[PDB]
Design a protein around this ligand. Structure first.
Ligand SMILES: *[C@@H]1O[C@H](CO)[C@@H](O)[C@H](O)[C@H]1NC(C)=O
Ligand SMILES: *[C@@H]1O[C@H](CO)[C@@H](O)[C@H](O)[C@H]1NC(C)=O
Lengths: 148, 284, 148
């Protein structure tokens, strides 16, 4: 059990990326869905949504530098919003290095949602998304290794 | 720290505190931190001027965890060293977390001087620890000019009948205890009109406090002034007494002539008496 | 009797018998209201400084309406408005009714400076068309500096 000061948030903010982890095709184009709903199950009509992007070396590291670019502000409509963010322009000189090969590490994205119609605020974040040259991995399931 | 509208500028002006055994020169290397409220950022191009400068008072600047970090070599013991920067803020928030201005020597992080600040204007001000204020609104009032001829006797009735205006009465200032920051204004009640709830009586010799920031409302000791203002605040550190007067903004303060009469002229005093009798007979 | 809140209540039960342990499916009990008011209620609200204290009134009624919201505070929290009428305890906000569009919301702000250690009870009364209701919120404060 966690002992903290919770404040008991007013509305749920779910961040759904179109793809789990960014590959070759998704470097130039990456789309992410932001959807915020009230706890009474009725979707948020209209609200302002501010997105923040960043790069991290590891999951244990709480602090790392970030753009410096945007900060793209879109408005949540009928409980859903979506935005496209490309890495090619993102990293560049801002991250001091630009390539999919140059930087292999997690990408942390922050989202701040405020209601335009009345005062409220809620925040969410993605721990990280790593750009990997070698996609996925391999494993065996329900396959005992023996020969008959 | 102070925030003025005159993009908005933020000033610091902080100094080193000398020790009895320490001859005043300057201060050891210290990190200067400024906490920006959530959803507020500062302009780096405006902050670059501190680094770019031929005369360097600051080695480096940085932004970490939504805070402004800039290291200073020496803090002047003689005067306060000012730091100015412009900010860019984007809307929000549900609730603004209290903004803190802190400074600490890099050698010992143990002790850090911290002070709260708000970008927004202060509506409520002057809360005393000793007398347990009991505000005392921040807004400033003004006193009517000395011996303003007529113009007008009718306007006083309109100001006194205002629902916001509670106590309208004739008083005579006796004693004055300057600041900090009170200006007690010990007075004496000659006559009352309204005098609405909950206060009462006469010749009670009550007091009303005002911040020194208003130099226009300055009262002359011994001269009787007609005062019309907001309802009296309740109590104090003393649980008894119990009805001290606020003397807030937009209070009516006008010099009531005592001495001759005809002062060019006595007719002005008749204009003051007409308002008194009209409000006493009929009223609001 | 259900508690009074805008959030959805999730009730859950488990059972123990000689057969074994059984966890029942979570039952979601949705508690909703057509016209209601809710506020941020910040945690710990440091003493000596004024706060914004933002809240929002919600109208799910299809037709438009005018709303009035007043605040009543126990002794003591410095208020920038005043006076108290008619009752000494009742604090008149001198509320001007503002129009609220159908399926829309409006913003409510209260500037208040707490003068004493919490927690203190602060009421927000809502006078509106389509009925009226008042909610009771508690405000807690904490001293300036801290050293253990
Ligand atoms: C309240 O304050 C006065 C100063 O104005 C103090 O001297 C006195 O002890 C107090 N009065 C009573 C009745 O306690
Ligand atoms: C809030 O209303 C309730 C009703 O029981 C009352 O007990 C209490 O006096 C109220 N609080 C304030 C600060 O007016």
């Amino acid at each position: 059990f966690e002992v903290k000061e919770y404040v008991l948030p007013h509305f749920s903010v779910s961040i759904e990326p179109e793809y789990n982890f960014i590959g070759y095709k998704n470097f130039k184009n990456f789309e992410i869905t932001i959807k915020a709903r009230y706890f009474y199950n009725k979707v948020v009509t209209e609200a302002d949504v501010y997105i923040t992007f960043g790069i991290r070396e590891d999951l244990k590291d709480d602090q790392k530098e970030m753009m410096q670019t945007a900060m793209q502000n879109t408005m949540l409509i009928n409980g859903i919003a979506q935005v496209t963010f490309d890495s090619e322009t993102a990293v560049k000189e801002l991250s001091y290095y630009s390539l999919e090969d140059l930087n292999n590490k997690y990408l942390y994205i922050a989202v701040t949602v405020i209601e335009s119609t009345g005062g409220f605020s809620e925040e969410a974040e993605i721990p990280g998304i790593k750009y990997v040259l070698s996609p996925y991995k391999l494993n065996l399931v329900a396959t005992p290794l023996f020969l008959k | 720290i102070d925030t003025q509208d005159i993009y908005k500028r933020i000033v610091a002006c902080a100094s080193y505190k000398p020790s009895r055994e320490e001859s005043s020169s300057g201060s050891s290397h210290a990190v200067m931190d400024i906490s920006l409220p959530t959803g507020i950022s500062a302009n780096e191009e405006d902050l670059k001027a501190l680094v770019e400068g031929v005369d360097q008072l600051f080695t480096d600047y940085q932004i970490k965890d939504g805070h402004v970090i800039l290291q200073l070599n020496s803090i002047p013991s003689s005067d306060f060293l000012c730091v100015r920067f412009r900010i860019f803020e984007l809307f929000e928030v549900g609730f603004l977390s209290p903004a803190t201005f802190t400074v600490y020597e890099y050698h010992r992080p143990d002790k850090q001087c911290t002070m709260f600040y708000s970008t927004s204007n202060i509506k409520i001000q002057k809360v005393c620890e000793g007398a347990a204020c009991k505000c005392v609104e921040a807004d400033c009032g003004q006193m009517q000019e000395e011996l303003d001829l007529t113009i007008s006797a009718e306007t006083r009735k309109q100001t006194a009948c205002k629902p916001e205006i509670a106590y309208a009465y004739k008083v005579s200032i006796t004693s004055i205890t300057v600041e900090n920051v009170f200006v007690k204004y010990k007075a004496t009640l000659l006559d009352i009109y309204k005098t609405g709830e909950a206060v009462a009586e006469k010749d009670s010799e009550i007091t009303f406090i005002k911040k020194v920031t208003c130099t226009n409302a300055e009262l002359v000791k011994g001269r009787q002034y007609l005062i019309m203002g907001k309802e009296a605040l309740q109590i104090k550190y003393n649980f008894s007494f119990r009805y001290i007067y606020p003397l807030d903004s937009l209070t009516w303060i006008e010099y009531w002539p005592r001495d001759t009469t005809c002062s060019s002229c006595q007719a002005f005093l008749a204009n003051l008496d007409e308002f008194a009798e009209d409000i006493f007979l009929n009223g609001c | 009797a259900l508690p009074d809140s805008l959030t959805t209540w999730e009730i859950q039960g488990v059972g123990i018998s000689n057969t074994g342990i059984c966890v029942a499916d979570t039952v979601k009990a949705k508690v909703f209201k057509d016209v209601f008011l809710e506020m941020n209620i910040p945690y710990s609200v440091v003493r000596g400084e004024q706060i914004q204290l933002k809240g929002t009134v919600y109208n799910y009624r299809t037709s438009g309406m005018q709303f009035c919201v007043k605040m009543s505070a126990v002794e003591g929290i410095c208020t920038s408005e005043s006076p108290v009428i008619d009752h000494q305890g009742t604090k008149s906000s001198k509320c001007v009714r503002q129009k609220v569009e159908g399926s829309s919301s409006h913003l409510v702000t209260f500037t208040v400076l707490p003068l004493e250690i919490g927690l203190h009870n602060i009421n927000f009364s809502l006078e509106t068309w389509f009925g009226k209701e008042i909610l009771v919120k508690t405000l807690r404060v904490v001293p300036e500096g801290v050293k253990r």
